[PDB]
Design a protein around this ligand. Structure first.
Ligand SMILES: OC[C@H]1O[C@@](CO)(O[C@H]2O[C@H](CO)[C@@H](O)[C@H](O)[C@H]2O)[C@@H](O)[C@@H]1O
Ligand SMILES: OC[C@H]1O[C@@](CO)(O[C@H]2O[C@H](CO)[C@@H](O)[C@H](O)[C@H]2O)[C@@H](O)[C@@H]1O
Ligand SMILES: OC[C@H]1O[C@@](CO)(O[C@H]2O[C@H](CO)[C@@H](O)[C@H](O)[C@H]2O)[C@@H](O)[C@@H]1O
Ligand code: NO2
Ligand code: NO2
Ligand code: NO2
Ligand code: NO2
Ligand code: NO2
Ligand code: NO2
Ligand code: NO2
Ligand code: NO2
Ligand code: NO2
Ligand code: CU
Ligand code: CU
Ligand code: CU
Ligand code: CU
Ligand code: CU
Ligand code: CU
Lengths: 334, 334, 334
């Protein structure tokens, strides 16, 4: 009965984002996505700590889905028989049925197809939510991602001017709760079910052992640093499905920031640090002015430096001595 | 000397709100309220955990008081002789004398009458604040509520359009600190005074044992679910006198949100999750589009699902398949 | 090559702020500041608890630096040989080289001179950031302050009207992590290096032992209360380099608040409590209407009353009975 064109999207792993238009002359379509749930034991730090992860499409965060206002998002959610638990999906962008959660509960061996109309613009969390105490556990195990619903005319600054990004990255931040044994070492478990009792006990005390971007300490550093060039406008979408975060680009700013993440509201300008409320996504754009390394952090610096929540940008281009210069290099005090 | 008409209000227990006008053709009046303090041992969870509560009018939160800009709010605060402690009241809506606290300290057996002019619009916390370390203790024991100061022309969207709600609910969120004994069971106490030493020790560690709406786990579920119909615009006032919260309506949105709670500022639009700073009230309105059950939570999902901070809405009306539909019910993977 | 006039500033200790113009007819200048790092053991509470502090210019917070948009800020950072550790400086107001941190690392016995162009208006954090796990440790040891970059036309309300303050105060809030011994007493250490292992262990658990303004419990009370008169417009700049805060003026309001701290955005009006994201500064102005004592707090009241985060204002002037009056003093219940 819904007679619109269908478009398939090939999702890509974060922090990258599948190809899409900002402004578009397309009208509404049914945009088709597939998410396959994977439960897996992963390594989350450089010491080799393991973690019983539960993921959409194998990644933490789940991939960014991008559509336009008035599109219909049709998701095939697949829970292979190789998984152990039921799962579902709640889209904060969607209206009704607990975001879709009440229509998508699938046992191992099942799949389901949900369609929702993208009536609200912005960046939004999606996450699993199977019921009761399982809700936080599946979310903090990694089962969360985001979806971006763009205006058909692209982004604007609330003063009539278009804001076009040259690239977009998705940084998903994950609070993780890994219990310790008596002597103080992190515990390893054979299954998510086996990890549950100790992990819930820790969860209820509200202090994570790790806070990471893209699923691991250091994920977005070295070979996998984010990149830009001087003169490039970069959009950084940041999500946190369970706990607050305060993003900050060290050596830069948020030129235009939607900290609550919703494009019906004008962006704020010229921020140092912004705030992602737990259960939300927000977005910040910045035009790089200087080359070199930047760190992108949550500005609880204990979390950033000690618990895992640091990414890098490596930026190419020409240094601008008008903006900053070392007038006198380090020298002995006279 | 103040020669205005007097109007009595009969307060009602949360989450309901006493009858009031949004837009009004009344001019300023002296609006008369009575709050009677009650210290009492209550049950706060489905396991039968007890808690030494201290309340305005017997409830957590204290009732919502509603007036209009330029009204004078005249409160008779009563501390019956059956209570054990001194108490007072600080209105964040008021100007001077620590919000009224410096003019309202009453021993058991006393009452006091305070008047303040409602010069600031919005939703505001009120709470007890007797001095020193007693301040946090009385607040986290339950002695907090809110007051709404409406513009005389009612609410607007900051773009010239009236925003009229069909109903309003007040959700007061309470962080509670219940100590445990050596074997890990919650402790019970014979009096607030007896609970104080153990409770303060826990308080200073900044992790609540319970986070509840309307005073108890499950208070706003089952028979006492919040209700609406498709097409109804519902205002949800949310307060937290001591600790941050991040409200979220699962399956809905905040169509118009004043997260800082103050009507001199335009609302933000189309939010997924909003943020109530500890020590404040905020407000969100939503027009329901779909029938069914919704959950209203703080979106720290550990707090929501595990510590008590979940309410339900039951919504009547016709399902809208354009907004959401289950294209294919759960089935075996091909 | 940069041929502008040079102006020296004599910094003053917080909460006071060096003399400056709001609106100015001066054009851009090179504004010269000197910061001398001091590592020192200090007393942080009325019980005599000691703390291994690391400071810019001897104070926590470091002093407020005030310039105008388009000025060049030239800082001589000095690390005397009497210190033990390397240090540097990151300005959130600056563009490039990790805010200056990558250009300012100095060993004991060295100094460095950094210049940055003040292209972003607002209040901004500055802090030390020597690398890795040292970053949070130096910040939570006290090595943070703020810089205010004013529009050349002064502040405005976003509706065309000037906002001129009669005085400005800088409240720097510091989360401190002081370990305890087995019997529960705070530990003392002979050096910052000796304090590091125990202090890091505690830091990673994300619960401070103390949260203070101006470096000590009670710093901004008694002789050192903040002051005002009825009719005076006071700007309160609040910073927190590592952890969120929720300022509140008990008995007052935020008449105009930039909670994200950036003057390119209009202020919000009529707030009760505002929110300083960790890693940022914000600012609130209030015109006092009533005499008497006010408390200025973070409205986690446990932190305010029990962990140290309370300042006072003493305000002179005439009481306004229209705004507030005690209709009936405390009396026996009829
Ligand atoms: O940036 C959103 C903000 O901008 C305003 C103009 O101040 O509206 C603009 O953006 C709307 C949503 O994209 C457009 O529909 C509108 O035409 C455009 O002016 C605000 O109304 C809005 O809050
Ligand atoms: O919603 C408050 C927001 O709306 C504006 C118009 O953009 O003012 C409106 O609301 C005021 C307060 O109710 C009215 O007095 C005013 O007349 C009306 O236009 C903003 O000024 C305000 O921030
Ligand atoms: O208060 C900042 C806010 O005000 C507006 C007007 O609504 O611009 C004013 O402030 C700018 C920055 O100081 C001035 O350049 C501008 O001329 C003045 O109108 C907004 O554009 C801005 O967000
Ligand atoms: O050693 N088990 O906690
Ligand atoms: O500047 N950030 O640590
Ligand atoms: O290298 N000292 O001047
Ligand atoms: O058993 N008392 O903590
Ligand atoms: O969608 N909320 O868990
Ligand atoms: O029910 N299985 O297709
Ligand atoms: O007594 N040392 O922790
Ligand atoms: O009103 N403040 O506690
Ligand atoms: O002092 N009693 O009315
Ligand atoms: Cu799941
Ligand atoms: Cu959710
Ligand atoms: Cu009390
Ligand atoms: Cu208060
Ligand atoms: Cu340092
Ligand atoms: Cu920083």
């Amino acid at each position: 009965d819904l007679k619109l064109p269908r478009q398939k999207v090939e999702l890509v792993a974060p922090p990258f984002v599948h190809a899409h238009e900002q402004a578009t002359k397309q009208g509404p379509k049914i945009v088709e996505f597939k998410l396959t749930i994977e439960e897996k034991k992963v390594v989350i730090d450089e010491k080799g700590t393991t973690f019983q992860a539960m993921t959409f499409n194998g990644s933490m965060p789940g991939p960014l889905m991008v559509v336009h206002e008035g599109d219909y998002v049709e998701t095939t959610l697949v829970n292979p028989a190789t998984n152990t638990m039921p799962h579902n999906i709640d889209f904060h962008s969607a209206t009704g049925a607990l975001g879709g959660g009440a229509l998508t509960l699938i046992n191992p061996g099942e799949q389901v197809v949900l369609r929702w109309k993208a009536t609200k613009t912005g960046v939004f969390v999606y996450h699993c939510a199977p019921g009761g105490p399982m809700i936080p556990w599946h979310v903090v195990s990694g089962m969360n991602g985001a979806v971006m619903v763009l205006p058909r005319d692209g982004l604007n600054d609330g003063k009539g001017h278009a804001l076009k990004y040259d690239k977009v990255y998705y940084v998903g931040e994950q609070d993780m709760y890994v219990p310790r044994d008596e002597k103080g070492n992190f515990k390893s478990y054979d299954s998510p079910g086996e990890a549950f009792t100790d992990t819930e006990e820790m969860m209820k005390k509200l202090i994570p052992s790790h806070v990471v971007f893209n699923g691991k300490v250091g994920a977005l550093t070295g070979k996998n640093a984010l990149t830009a060039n001087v003169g490039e406008n970069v959009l950084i979408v940041h999500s946190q499905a369970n706990r607050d975060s305060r993003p900050h680009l060290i050596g830069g700013h948020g030129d235009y920031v939607w900290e609550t993440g919703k494009f019906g509201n004008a962006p704020e300008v010229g921020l140092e640090t912004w705030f992602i409320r737990g259960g939300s996504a927000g977005a910040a754009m910045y035009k790089f002015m200087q080359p070199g390394i930047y760190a992108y952090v949550t500005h609880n610096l204990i979390e950033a430096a000690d618990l895992c929540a640091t990414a890098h940008f490596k930026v190419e281009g020409k240094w601008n001595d008008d903006l900053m210069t070392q007038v006198k290099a380090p020298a002995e005090i006279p």
